[PDB]
């Protein structure tokens, strides 16, 4: 399972969608049209094909400076 951030079109996306591909909602952003989701590592391509999904971005790492 991997964590991914999906930029969505709210007119065509529903958070209940992600269960359909074996994933689940971690966090829905209030301030930007995006949702954090855990998906099976092998379902990323499938997620990019899901309704209302505009961009799928891996969760990158920052470090203390």
Partner 1 sequence: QPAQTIPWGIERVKAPSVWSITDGSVSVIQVAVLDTGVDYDHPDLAANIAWCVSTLRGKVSTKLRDCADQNGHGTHVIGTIAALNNDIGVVGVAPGVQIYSVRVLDARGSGSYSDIAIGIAQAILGPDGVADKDGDGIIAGDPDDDAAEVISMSLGGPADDSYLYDMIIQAYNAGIVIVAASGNEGAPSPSYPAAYPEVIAVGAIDSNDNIASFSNRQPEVSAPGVDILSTYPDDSYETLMGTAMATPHVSGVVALIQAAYYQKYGKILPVGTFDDISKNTVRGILHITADDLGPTGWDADYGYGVVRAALAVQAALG
The token duo for 50 is 């899901």
How far apart are the two ends of the chain, measured CA to CA in Å? 29
11 binds, among partner 1, Zn ion, none (CB under 5 to 8 A by kind): none
Give me the residue label for tokens 């379902």: 43
Q: State the pairing for strand pair 24-28/34-39.
A: antiparallel
Residue from the set 29, 40, 48, 49 that interacts with partner 1 by CB under 8 A: 29
Q: Is 41 in the site for partner 1 (CB under 8 A)?
A: no
In angstroms, what is the minimal distance from the CB of 27 to partner 1?
4
Among the listed ranges 13-21, 39-47, 52-60, the one in contact with partner 1 (CB under 8 A) is 52-60
């Amino acid at each position: 399972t991997i964590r991914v951030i999906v930029s969505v079109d709210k007119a065509k996306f529903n958070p209940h969608e992600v269960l359909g591909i074996g994933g689940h909602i971690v966090y829905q952003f209030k301030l930007i049209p995006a949702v954090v989701v855990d998906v099976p590592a092998n379902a990323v391509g499938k997620l990019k094909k899901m309704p209302g999904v505009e961009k799928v971005e891996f969760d990158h790492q920052a470090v203390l400076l």
